[PDB]
């Protein structure tokens, strides 16, 4: 009845409706406060960020694009020298910034612009005030949330050293969700515990051979590598989505740190009781309903697991842009065995399978969402799942609500 660990997963390239890693800036710049994200790219990349940010663009945010010109395209020794001029000019007019991220785009990568070395020389040139990093967010490398992965993995090698036995919760999460996590972890008697990324450059976590760390977002493969390479050890756990996710999430940290039986139940019961009851309100329109998800964020597998076990949905095809085998093991084993899994995408083919299934609710991209509505399928645009708080106990009612809303709306316009 329950278990997808030995499921064969369709790996599938082709035409792909997805976002590049660039987009991660749109929320990362919010959490990371003394940081600045300068994409080295074309007008196209500026355009994406500008459309993606939406009204955020007018809020004088901490990102921009250094858009390439004809002159920059050819000759690579002048491309680097001109860049440093851009940066110095930028850096000298925003002294509030301590962290600069040179984000790599497709055009920067095709022009073989060594931005890892540009970051290199710029750190030395602008220390002690400003450290500058480099990471890829290009179409050729990244899908949507993988932009956060490469970003953080870039910060890792340069973090501080420590023999301390610290906990690190990895992945940027809304500041509301973050505090809940911190408080529950202090309540269970585990500390000290820092987030990565921290809200500010001065208060970043430190790594050492004794650091345990734990992922809060599933799309954090490269960052794990980075951390394990500095000698920290991961705590494997299902992702904190729903009463069950969060409990099992917190249970792994408890067991890794030696928190007692009663001590867990005591801290956990009340917050749980609450979440289970907020989720009930939605079971109504959700139970029995068939579910299908297009590939986007890598949040599909854990959320699908959640929708099936707590909101009683029946799963059909759950697609992910990339499936990291080991990170996803705890969740995979909890997925309803009937589930069909896909890694990657072929758009034309997947749309054909979609129709054939004809599912009650479809998670999918915004360029895909409206055309599907017109064809008579109810849809829940995926991109919300990153901007809305969703992790841990309080938000678990709201999480379910995200998927009950569109269905309650189609019922309601009839």
């Amino acid at each position: 009845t329950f278990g997808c660990t030995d499921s064969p997963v369709r790996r599938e390239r082709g035409q792909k409706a997805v976002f590049c890693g660039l987009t991660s800036i749109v929320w990362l710049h919010r959490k990371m406060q003394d940081a600045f994200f300068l994409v080295v790219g074309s007008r196209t990349c500026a355009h994406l960020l500008q459309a993606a940010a939406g009204v955020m663009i007018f809020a004088e945010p901490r990102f921009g694009t250094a858009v390439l010109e004809e002159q920059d395209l050819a000759g690579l020794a002048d491309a680097h020298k001109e860049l440093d001029r851009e940066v110095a000019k930028l850096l000298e007019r925003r002294p509030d910034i301590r962290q600069l991220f040179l984000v790599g785009s497709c055009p920067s990568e095709v022009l073989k612009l060594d931005l890892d070395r540009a970051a290199e020389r710029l750190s030395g040139l602008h220390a002690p005030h400003v450290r500058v990093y480099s990471y890829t967010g290009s179409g050729l490398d990244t899908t949507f949330t993988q932009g956060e992965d490469t970003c953080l993995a870039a910060m890792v090698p340069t973090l501080d050293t420590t023999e301390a036995a610290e906990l690190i919760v990895v992945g940027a999460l809304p500041d509301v969700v973050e505090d809940q996590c911190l408080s529950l972890l202090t309540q269970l008697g585990v500390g000290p515990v820092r987030m990565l990324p921290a809200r500010r450059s001065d208060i970043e976590p430190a790594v050492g051979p004794n650091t345990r760390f734990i992922l809060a977002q599933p799309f954090l493969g490269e960052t794990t590598g980075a951390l394990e390479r500095r000698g920290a050890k991961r705590i494997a756990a299902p992702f904190p989505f729903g009463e069950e996710g969060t409990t099992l999430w917190l249970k792994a940290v408890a067991d890794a740190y030696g928190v007692s039986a009663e001590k867990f139940e005591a801290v956990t019961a009340a917050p749980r009781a609450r979440a289970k009851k907020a989720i009930a309100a939605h079971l109504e329109t959700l139970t029995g309903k068939s579910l299908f998800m297009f590939p986007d964020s890598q949040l599909e597998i854990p959320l699908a697991r959640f929708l099936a076990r707590e909101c009683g949905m029946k799963t059909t095809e759950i697609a992910t842009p990339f499936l990291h085998k080991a990170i996803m093991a705890p969740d995979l084993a909890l997925l309803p065995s009937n589930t069909a899994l896909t890694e990657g995408q072929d758009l034309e083919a997947q749309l054909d399978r979609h129709e054939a299934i004809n599912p009650d609710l479809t998670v999918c991209g915004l360029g895909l969402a409206n055309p599907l509505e017109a064809k008579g399928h109810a849809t829940k645009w995926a991109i919300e799942l990153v901007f809305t708080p969703v992790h841990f106990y309080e938000q678990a009612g709201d999480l379910a609500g995200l998927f009950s809303r569109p269905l309650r709306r189609r019922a309601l316009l009839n």
Binding site: V40, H47, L48, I57, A66, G139, N370
Partner: protein, 419 residues
């Protein structure tokens, strides 16, 4: 290298998409990486369409570079014809793809498809959204239109109307109404609405209406070279320009100018006593060439505002705008840098701003009342309600729109003041 936050226009290909999406039975295949499909959301979200754009990407990534890019274009080109059996297709290069060896032509020839495949040069590092479109349409017209015997009925073509165009939908409807009122009929409206076959037909219309220079000027010119078709040199925005338009259409066709003015409420509205307090108001106008020139006439000549700054972001419209600005004794402000706009507004401190999405956000920041006259624009400026700029019902919409954010006669003279 040029540091950029805001961008008035997109890349040229997005402009190609506007032409493609405007059309039916046309497939545009774009050579580019995963992710450049973000541009799809512009159409399904802002313009809010009931189907996928007819745009498909080769979708190359890191693990498939080299000689696979070459193969990948081939495959997207095939699949698109196979699946959508379209009347014709267009192929072009993304900004990333422009740094590759791959020949758009040479490949599409080596497939030898049973329909025309139009290659499109789109200089991504020098040109923008508008040129993208203007040219994509040109190529299409140059590829598909032929000389033809004229229609027995006096007819014309509507040129420049695209997808994702500011008030294109209703303008096209209201200009049609104007011409029907003069006993003239639309032969083909292109791009918007038209198919590759509709385009083959262009040559039979007697003349053309250049509705939007920035996206049709090239094709209008070509249809003058090729099929003796003069085109309209006045865009019918504002009561005055509509009169000038119909007077021009008269000379082109020898036809009496017959108009229906029974619903034209703007003249009286602004003439009325309620509006005396509008005389003098310092207005700053910015946007693209067309909508800015047009607005500046309505402001000065029709409403009684005083124009204290004029600009546009599209360089291809620089001399027309500098010519027009001279008439009001201003330096036109040709820029694509919102900070220069921001700086110029600040300088010549207007009492009203007419601009783009950006300008209205600069206006918020400054606390100045503002209305939108031009692309680029957010989703609320693709309204469900009828809302042209052009002609007589446009002139009404224009009045209501511009007067709205102000402060009326009394309070001046308020809820704060009274608070």
């Amino acid at each position: 290298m040029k540091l950029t936050l805001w961008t008035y226009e997109g890349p040229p290909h997005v402009g190609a998409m506007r032409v493609a999406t405007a059309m039916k039975d046309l497939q545009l295949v774009l050579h580019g990486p995963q992710g450049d499909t973000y541009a799809d959301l512009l159409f399904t979200m802002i313009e809010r369409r009931n189907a996928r754009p007819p745009v498909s990407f080769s979708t190359f990534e890191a693990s498939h570079m080299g000689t696979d890019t070459a193969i990948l274009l081939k495959d997207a080109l095939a699949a698109a014809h196979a699946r959508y059996k379209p009347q014709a297709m267009a192929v072009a290069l993304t900004c990333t793809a422009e740094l590759l060896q791959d020949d758009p032509n040479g490949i599409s020839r080596a497939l030898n498809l049973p329909v025309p495949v139009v290659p499109l040069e789109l200089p991504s590092y020098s040109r923008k959204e508008n040129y993208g479109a203007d040219e994509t349409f040109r190529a299409l017209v140059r590829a598909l239109a032929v000389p033809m015997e004229r229609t027995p009925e006096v007819t014309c073509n509507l040129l420049g109307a695209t997808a994702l165009g500011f008030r294109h939908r209703d303008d096209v409807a209201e200009v049609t109404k104007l011409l029907a009122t003069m006993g003239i009929k639309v032969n083909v409206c292109a791009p918007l609405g038209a198919s590759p076959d509709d385009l083959r037909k262009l040559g039979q219309a007697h003349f053309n209406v250049l509705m939007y220079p920035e996206t049709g000027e090239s094709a209008a010119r070509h249809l003058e070279r090729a099929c003796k078709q003069p085109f309209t040199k006045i865009v019918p925005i504002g009561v005055g320009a509509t009169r000038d338009f119909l007077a021009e259409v008269s000379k082109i066709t020898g036809l009496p100018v017959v108009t229906d003015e029974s619903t034209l409420r703007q003249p009286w509205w602004s003439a009325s006593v309620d509006s005396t307090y509008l005389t003098g108001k310092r207005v700053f106008i910015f946007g693209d060439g067309t909508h800015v020139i047009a607005a500046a006439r309505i402001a000065a000549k029709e409403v009684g505002f005083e124009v204290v700054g004029m600009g546009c972001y599209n360089r291809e419209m620089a001399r027309p705008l500098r010519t027009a600005a001279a008439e009001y004794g201003l330096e036109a402000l040709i820029t694509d840098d919102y900070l220069e706009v921001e700086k110029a507004i600040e300088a010549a401190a207007p009492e009203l701003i007419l601009g783009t999405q950006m300008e209205r956000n600069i206006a918020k920041k400054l606390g100045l009342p503002c209305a939108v006259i031009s692309a680029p624009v957010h989703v609320q400026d693709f309204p469900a309600r009828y809302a042209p700029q052009m002609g007589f019902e446009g002139a009404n919409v224009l009045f209501d729109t511009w007067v709205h954010p102000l402060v009326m006669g009394l309070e001046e003279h308020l809820l704060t003041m009274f608070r």
